[PDB]
């Protein structure tokens, strides 16, 4: 089998992407944030604390003839941006772009933190990291991909995120019309439960390529590109007036600037992030200080190839017995 679904930016900055997901019978369609950096599929629901729901579409398991309470199971998750959610668990039928999994764990939120409530466009998350990170207790549950894998034509999914435009998540096949050149594959470590890999280096604008190993994760659920302070400093040094602001929480730059591109290595191949992809707009409405899309990972503890990087590429998440990652230009 295969599936194919369009993924759409939630706002004009590409802060995140939502993909429609059918849950239950009859289908209840929720717009979920597909997140290759976590492993829980959780939704706003009829059980979510009323004051914490503000415009989201909810899953109501009592209206689904295929929903079953997973007795005794609870979940609780905290994300890198300081947000969190928790609740109980149902199994139900879940379909993405025509690909159906029966008995998928659908984690129903009883509580969500403020930043989830305040974002009306995201109805939950669909985790696509390794199932070893799934938070369900006392019996850990499998991701949608893990459950679908054996049935797929090929045990892969691909992320093709757009810049200020829709894109595509495919399951079970590689769309050879969706990228240019060849896909370069690179080794993955699953030791931390992430799609963790090692970039071979970087360049800033038309500068020379620096060969240096950068371990990090391919994370569709993080907006920005987080890299070592040395790399990030080298980038922003090429932008007149750019500076790291402790008050704002990262590098800012004059909105009048023209940003240079940033290139990252995948083996001997190179992915070029255009400068405009690195512009996250005014720090506050009406400001002429703009927020940078490349930020330091210092004090995160891991480098993160988030949407800023991934949207410059066609990305293959190869879930074969030994997983790998593939990147192509597009």
Question: How do the strands and helices of this protein lay out in sequence?
Answer:
Elements: E1 3-9, E2 17-23, E3 28-35, E4 41-43, E5 68-78, E6 84-96, E7 99-112, H1 114-117, E8 124-127, H2 144-148, E9 156-160, E10 167-171, E11 184-187, E12 196-204, E13 210-218, E14 225-227, H3 229-236, E15 243-245, E16 250-254, E17 262-266, E18 269-273, E19 279-282, E20 289-292, E21 294-296, E22 303-305, H4 307-310, E23 314-318, E24 324-328
Parallel strand pairs: 3-8, 4-7, 13-22, 14-21
Antiparallel strand pairs: 1-2, 1-10, 2-3, 2-6, 4-8, 5-6, 6-7, 9-10, 9-23, 11-24, 12-13, 12-17, 14-22, 15-16, 16-20, 17-18, 19-20, 23-24
Radius of gyration: 20 Å
| CATH top level assignment of the largest domain | Mainly Beta
- Count of spatially separate domains: 2
Give the CATH topology of the largest domain. Answer: Cathepsin D, subunit A, domain 1
Q: Looking at the structure, what is the overall shape?
A: globular
- Which structural category do the helix and sheet elements fall into? mainly beta
Catalytic activity: Hydrolysis of proteins with specificity similar to that of pepsin A, prefers hydrophobic residues at P1 and P1', but does not cleave 14-Ala-|-Leu-15 in the B chain of insulin or Z-Glu-Tyr. Clots milk
Family: Belongs to the peptidase A1 family.
Protein name: Endothiapepsin
Keywords: Aspartyl protease, Disulfide bond, Hydrolase, Protease, Signal, Zymogen
């Amino acid at each position: 089998s295969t599936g194919s679904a369009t993924t759409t930016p939630i706002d004009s900055l590409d802060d995140a992407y939502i993909t429609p997901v059918q849950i239950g019978t009859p289908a209840q369609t929720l717009n979920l944030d597909f997140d290759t950096g976590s492993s829980d599929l959780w939704v706003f629901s009829s059980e979510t604390t009323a004051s914490e729901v503000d415009g989201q579409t909810i899953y109501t398991p009592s209206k689904s003839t295929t929903a079953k309470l997973l007795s005794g199971a609870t979940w609780s998750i905290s994300y890198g941006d300081g947000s969190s959610s928790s609740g109980d668990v149902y199994t139900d039928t879940v379909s993405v772009g025509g690909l159906t999994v029966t008995g998928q764990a659908v984690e129903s939120a009883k509580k969500v933190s403020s930043s989830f409530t305040e974002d009306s466009t995201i109805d939950g998350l669909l985790g696509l990291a390794f199932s070893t990170l799934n938070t369900v207790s006392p019996t850990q549950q499998k991701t949608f991909f893990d459950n679908a894998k054996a049935s797929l034509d090929s045990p892969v999914f691909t992320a093709d995120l757009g810049y200020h435009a829709p894109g595509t998540y495919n399951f079970g096949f590689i769309d050879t019309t969706a990228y240019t050149g060849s896909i370069t594959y690179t080794a993955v470590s699953t030791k931390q439960g992430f799609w963790e890999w090692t970039s071979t280096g970087y360049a800033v604008g038309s500068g020379t390529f620096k060969s240096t190993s950068i371990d990090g994760i391919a994370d569709t659920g993080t907006t920005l590109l987080y890299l070592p302070a040395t790399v990030v400093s080298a980038y922003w040094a090429q932008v007149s007036g750019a500076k790291s602001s402790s008050s704002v929480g990262g590098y800012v730059f004059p909105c009048s600037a023209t940003l240079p591109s940033f290139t990252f290595g995948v083996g001997s191949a190179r992915i070029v992030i255009p400068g405009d992809y690195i512009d996250f707009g005014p720090i506050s409405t009406g400001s002429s200080s703009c927020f940078g899309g490349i930020q330091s990972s210092a004090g995160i503890g891991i480098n993160i190839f988030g949407d800023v990087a991934l949207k410059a590429a066609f990305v293959v998440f190869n879930g074969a017995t030994t997983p790998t990652l593939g990147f192509a230009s597009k």
